C-alpha cells in the first residue's frame, strides 16, 4: 500500500524502559532477565543481587510494542514478536537482530514454544498463527536456506494468547471468539474447540504431557481443561477483573494468576477455595514469569503497565482464607528500575517544536526538524506553556507524530510531507543567499544522508543525529525496514533501502528535484 | 481526536478530527472513507444535526462522540 | 362518494414530507393535548418558536373542526375532506429557508425540524418561569437516552458516552431478509472495532481493537425507527433500497436495554417513499386507529393518509404491502402499551 517514512527522537542509548512491560524471559545458566518494553526495545538485566546497575544490553529493532519474546536453544536464541507486524529473530548471547520474518498481517501479539522440537509458534490480531522451525531460521542467503512458514486456520477472531506443549503435539489459542482452538502442529490438523469462557482469554498454560490446559480469561476465571476428555474439569474465579497472566509450577498443581485488579495469588488446584494473595502490584499485571531454581518457586517476576520491573519471593508458603486482606508480600524483592513515557504531546504552531510532557510531570522541548530536543523545562504547567509559546503564524502541515512507545515517533506521508515552505533566514539557517527550503524535502535527505545513492552529502542546512533510527513503513503499522540513520552505508542496508525507498522519497533524496 | 461515524450499513468508522475543524471538514473526511458528496450527507450528533460553517467545539464534540451519518430521502 | 370522517391534508406543492409526519403527529398519543398546554402557556405569558406552536394548534383545531363539521352533517362534503396547513409551511420557512419555493424534502428531516424547534420552546420557557409536565412534551413523547459502551480490549477500560436520540438509525441491508431484529442489532448490539480502523485508548496510549455497544437507558413514550433505506458505491453515486425489512408489530428493546424491562411497544404508523432514486419521490403515512368517540367501526384497521385522500386498508392487507411493494418503508412509529 502506501509507504510512510518515519523517525524516532530518542537518545542512543535508552538504559530504562520508557514504558510497560509485556514479557519476560529468565535465563537460569547466565542469571540474566529479557524484558520485552512497550517501548519496542528489549533489554537484558542481570539478577545478581550482587550488581548495582542490573542493565546489560538492549536490543533495538521492533517499531513498535514488543508483545511476546521466546528464549530458544538454551539462551543462545530471542524470538520476539510485535505490533510492529514482524517477528525477528535475535542473537541472545551478543544481542542482535539476525532476521526479520513478515509473514504476519496485523499486530503480532503471542508466541508458543516447543523445547523438544525447537518450534515456535506466532499468533496476532491477524487470526493467523505461523509455526516456525528455530534450526530453519538462520538462513544467511536465498541459496543457502530460505526461510519457509507453515500456518493454522479457523480462527474467526482476533488472537490474543497461544500456547504449546513441551513435546510439541498441541497448541491451542485463546481469541475474542471465547473459544480455545486446538491443532495438531505437526499435522496441522484441527483437533477440537473447547468452549465455555465468555470473554477473550489472554493467557495459556499447558502441562508437560499436553493433556492438561490452564486458560485465564478477561471474564476473571481461570479454566482447567481435560484434552483427553475434550472438556472443562475445573473453573476457578478467584480475580474480581480480567486474568491476563498465569503462571504454574513443575508439578502443574499451584497456579499463579494476575490482571487488571492488580492482586496477584496463588491457587493450588486440588483444593480451589483456598487461595493465597501473594502481593497487590502498583499497576495491572501483564505477564509473571516463576523463577524456577528451586521446586516450590523462590520468587516470581512481574511486568505491569509501569515501566519498573518487580521481583517478588515466595519464601514463606507453606491458607484458610478466601478472600484475603493482608497481601503476603508488600515490598519487592528486587527492582528495577523504569524511567518516565510520554503521554502528551502538542505540535506548536511553528510546524517546527513540539511541547511534551511525561508520566513525571515533565515537560520538554523539542526540535522536529533537527530531530532532538531543545530543552527540558521541569514541571510546569502544560496548557499554560502552550498559551505561552503561541505565536501568530501559519505553516501547513506536514508530519504527524505518535506516542505508543513512549518516545517521540514522527511520520511522514506524501499526501502533506512537502506542505511545508519555510524561508532559510526564519528557519535559522545560512550558506549568502536566502531562498525557500521544503521542511518535509529537507529532513529526508537529512534521513537518508548516509545513502551513497543520494551522493554526487545530506541537506546542506543541518544533520539529524547519526544514531536516530530511520523507519520505512506501510500506513497503520506495519514495519518494512527499519535502520539507523548513520548505518545506510552498509552493503545489507543499501541493498535494502533500494528494495523498501517508495518512489516518492527516491524523487527528493536521489533525483534532487522537488 | 478520534470519534466515531455510523455509516449506512451501520458499521462503525474512526475520523481523526481537531475541535476547530467545521463540519465541512469531517463530511470530506467521510468522502475520503466512504465516496459519499458532502452535499448529500446529513449527520446527526445526539439528536441534533451539524450544520455547515460551525465547528465540532460548537457542538461539544468530544473523543468518542458518535455522529450518524445518514442522507436526504427528498420526497 | 364512501367519504371518509378522517381528515386529509391538501398539498401546497410538493409538501407531503410535511404532511406525512404532520399526519403521524396528530394521532401519537401526548402530542395534541401537549401543545395544547404549551399554547395554553404562551396564551398567557406572550414570533419564532411561539409562532410554531400556535402555527400547530390552528392545524389541529382546523382538524378537529373540520371532523365535527363532517360528523354533524356529512351531506355537505363530496369527494374532500381536507385543510391546508399554510401557517405551519410558513413558520417553517422562516425557521429555516430550505423550506422555501417548493422542492421536494426529506420527512425525517423535518420532523427533527419540528420537534427539535418545540422543545427549544420548552427549555426557554423553563428559563422564563423557573427565574419568576408541559416542558416536558418533546422529552417523554420522542425522545430517549442512550448509552454507548467502548471497551479497549487491551486494558479493558470501558468508557461511556449518554446521548440523546428521538429516533434510532437503522440499516435495511447489508453491504436474505433481515428483521428489525437484526437492523436494530446492527444499531446497538456489540460492534468489534479492528484492523485498519482501530480504536485509540488514551489509557494505554496506542491503537486497539474494541468492542462497542450502545443500550437504551430511558425510553419514551414513542419509538421512532428511521430506516436506511438507501447505500452508496461511489460511482449521483448514491441509490435507494428499495427492498425493506421484516417489520412486526410489536416491538421490545430488553435485549438492548440497560435494565430489564416488559415495556413491549405496538407498531401504530409508517411513513413511506415511494420511487427508485433519492432525489425525488412522493411521502405518504399510514397510521392505525386505537384507543375512544363512536367510530370503533375502525379500530384495527389501518388509514392511509395520501395528502388530501385518505384510504382505509385492512390489518392483513396493508401487512403484506409492508414486508417484502409500491411505496418502501422509511420510518416507523410504535408506542408503549
Ligand atoms: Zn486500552
Redesign the pocket.
Same mark, same amino acid.
Do not use: A, D
Given at each position: 500500500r502506501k509507504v510512510q517514512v518515519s523517525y524516532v527522537i530518542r537518545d542512543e542509548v535508552e538504559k530504562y524502559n520508557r514504558n510497560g512491560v509485556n514479557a519476560l524471559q529468565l535465563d537460569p545458566a547466565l542469571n540474566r532477565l529479557f524484558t520485552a518494553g512497550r517501548d519496542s526495545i528489549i533489554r537484558i538485566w542481570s539478577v545478581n543481587q550482587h550488581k548495582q546497575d542490573p542493565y546489560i544490553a538492549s536490543m533495538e529493532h521492533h517499531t513498535d510494542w514488543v508483545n511476546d519474546i521466546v528464549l530458544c536453544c538454551n539462551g543462545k536464541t530471542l524470538i520476539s514478536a510485535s505490533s510492529d507486524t514482524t517477528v525477528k529473530v535475535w542473537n541472545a548471547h551478543k544481542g542482535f537482530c539476525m532476521s526479520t520474518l513478515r509473514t504476519h498481517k496485523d499486530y503480532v501479539k503471542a508466541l508458543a514454544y516447543a523445547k523438544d522440537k525447537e518450534l515456535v509458534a506466532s499468533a496476532g490480531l491477524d487470526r493467523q498463527i505461523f509455526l516456525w522451525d528455530v534450526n530453519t531460521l538462520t538462513a544467511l542467503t536465498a541459496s543457502n536456506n530460505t526461510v519457509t512458514t507453515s500456518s493454522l486456520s479457523g480462527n474467526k477472531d482476533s488472537i490474543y494468547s497461544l500456547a504449546m506443549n513441551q513435546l510439541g503435539t498441541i497448541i491451542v489459542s485463546g481469541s475474542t471468539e471465547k473459544v480455545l482452538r486446538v491443532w495438531d502442529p505437526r499435522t496441522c490438523a484441527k483437533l477440537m474447540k473447547l468452549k465455555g469462557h465468555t470473554d477473550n482469554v489472554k493467557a495459556l498454560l499447558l502441562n508437560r504431557d499436553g493433556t492438561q490446559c490452564l486458560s485465564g480469561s478477561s471474564d476473571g476465571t481461570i479454566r482447567l481443561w481435560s484434552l483427553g476428555q475434550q472438556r472443562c474439569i475445573a473453573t476457578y474465579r478467584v480475580h474480581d477483573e480480567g486474568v491476563w497472566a498465569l503462571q504454574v509450577n513443575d508439578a502443574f498443581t499451584h497456579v499463579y494468576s494476575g490482571g487488571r485488579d492488580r492482586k496477584i495469588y496463588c491457587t493450588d488446584l486440588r483444593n480451589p477455595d483456598i487461595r493465597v494473595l501473594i502481593c497487590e502490584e502498583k499497576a495491572p499485571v501483564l505477564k509473571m514469569e516463576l523463577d524456577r531454581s528451586a521446586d516450590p518457586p523462590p520468587a516470581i517476576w512481574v511486568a505491569t503497565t509501569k515501566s519498573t520491573v518487580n521481583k517478588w519471593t515466595l519464601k514463606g508458603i507453606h491458607n484458610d482464607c478466601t478472600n484475603p486482606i493482608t497481601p503476603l508480600c508488600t515490598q519487592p524483592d528486587q527492582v528495577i528500575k523504569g524511567g518516565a513515557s510520554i503521554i502528551q504531546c502538542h505540535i506548536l504552531n511553528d510546524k517546527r517544536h513540539i511541547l511534551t510532557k511525561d508520566t513525571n510531570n515533565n515537560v520538554a522541548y523539542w526540535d522536529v526538524l533537527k530531530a532532538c530536543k531543545v530543552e527540558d523545562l521541569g514541571k510546569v504547567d502544560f496548557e499554560d506553556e502552550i498559551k505561552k509559546r503561541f505565536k501568530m503564524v501559519y505553516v501547513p502541515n506536514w508530519f504527524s507524530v505518535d506516542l505508543k512507545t513512549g518516545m517521540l515517533t514522527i511520520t511522514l506521508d506524501e499526501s502533506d510531507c512537502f506542505a511545508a515552505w519555510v524561508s532559510a533566514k526564519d528557519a535559522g539557517f545560512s550558506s549568502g543567499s536566502d531562498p525557500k527550503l521544503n521542511l518535509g524535502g529537507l529532513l529526508l535527505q537529512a534521513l537518508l544522508e548516509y545513502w551513497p545513492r543520494t551522493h554526487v552529502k545530506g541537506n546542506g542546512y543541518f544533520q539529524v543525529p547519526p544514531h536516530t533510527p530511520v523507519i520505512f513503513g506501510e500506513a497503520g503499522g506495519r514495519t518494512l525496514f527499519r535502520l539507523l540513520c548513520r548505518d545506510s552505508g552498509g552493503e545489507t542496508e543499501s541493498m535494502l533501502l533500494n528494495e523498501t525507498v517508495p518512489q516518492w522519497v527516491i524523487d527528493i533524496t536521489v533525483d534532487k528535484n522537488m | 481526536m478520534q470519534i466515531f461515524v455510523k455509516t449506512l450499513t451501520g458499521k462503525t468508522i474512526t475520523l481523526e478530527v481537531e475541535p476547530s475543524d467545521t463540519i465541512e471538514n469531517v463530511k470530506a473526511k467521510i468522502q475520503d472513507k466512504e465516496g459519499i458528496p458532502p452535499d448529500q450527507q446529513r449527520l446527526i450528533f445526539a439528536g441534533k444535526q451539524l450544520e455547515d460553517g460551525r465547528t465540532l467545539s460548537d457542538y461539544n464534540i468530544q473523543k468518542e462522540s458518535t455522529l450518524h451519518l445518514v442522507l436526504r430521502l427528498r420526497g | 362518494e364512501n367519504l371518509l370522517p378522517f381528515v386529509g391534508l391538501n398539498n401546497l406543492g410538493n409538501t407531503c414530507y410535511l404532511n406525512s409526519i404532520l399526519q403521524v403527529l396528530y394521532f401519537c398519543p401526548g402530542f395534541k393535548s401537549g401543545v395544547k398546554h404549551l399554547f395554553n402557556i404562551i396564551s398567557r405569558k406572550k414570533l419564532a418558536s411561539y409562532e410554531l406552536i400556535c402555527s400547530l394548534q390552528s392545524l389541529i383545531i382546523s382538524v378537529e373542526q373540520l371532523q365535527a363539521s363532517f360528523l354533524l352533517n356529512p351531506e355537505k362534503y363530496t369527494d374532500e375532506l381536507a385543510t391546508q396547513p399554510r401557517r405551519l409551511l410558513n413558520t417553517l420557512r422562516e425557521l429555516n429557508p430550505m423550506y422555501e419555493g417548493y422542492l421536494q424534502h426529506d420527512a425525517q428531516e423535518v420532523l427533527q425540524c419540528i420537534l427539535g424547534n418545540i422543545q427549544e420552546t420548552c427549555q426557554l420557557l423553563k428559563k422564563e418561569e423557573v427565574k419568576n409536565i408541559g416542558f416536558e412534551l418533546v422529552e417523554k413523547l420522542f425522545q430517549g437516552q442512550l448509552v454507548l459502551r467502548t471497551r479497549?480490549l487491551? +486494558?479493558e477500560?470501558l468508557t461511556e458516552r449518554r446521548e440523546d436520540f428521538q429516533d434510532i438509525s437503522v440499516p435495511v441491508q447489508e453491504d436474505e431478509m433481515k428483521t428489525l431484529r437484526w437492523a436494530i442489532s446492527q444499531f446497538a448490539s456489540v460492534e468489534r472495532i479492528v484492523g485498519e480502523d482501530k480504536y485509540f +485508548?488514551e489509557? +494505554?496510549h496506542?491503537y486497539?481493537e474494541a468492542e462497542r455497544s450502545l443500550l437504551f437507558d430511558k425510553m419514551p413514550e414513542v419509538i421512532t425507527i428511521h430506516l436506511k433505506c438507501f447505500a452508496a458505491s461511489g460511482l449521483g453515486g448514491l441509490s435507494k433500497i428499495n427492498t425493506p425489512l421484516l417489520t412486526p408489530l410489536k416491538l421490545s428493546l430488553e435485549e438492548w436495554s440497560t435494565k430489564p424491562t416488559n415495556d413491549s411497544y405496538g407498531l401504530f404508523a409508517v411513513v413511506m417513499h415511494s420511487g427508485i432514486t433519492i432525489s425525488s419521490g412522493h411521502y405518504t403515512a399510514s397510521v392505525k386507529v386505537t384507543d375512544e368517540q363512536s367510530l370503533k367501526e375502525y379500530e384495527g384497521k389501518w388509514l392511509l393518509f395520501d395528502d388530501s385522500e385518505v384510504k382505509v386498508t385492512e390489518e392483513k392487507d396493508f401487512l403484506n404491502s409492508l414486508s417484502p411493494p409500491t411505496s418502501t418503508p422509511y420510518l416507523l412509529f410504535y408506542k408503549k402499551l
Open positions: - | - | 479497549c487491551e +486494558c477500560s +485508548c489509557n +494505554c496506542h486497539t
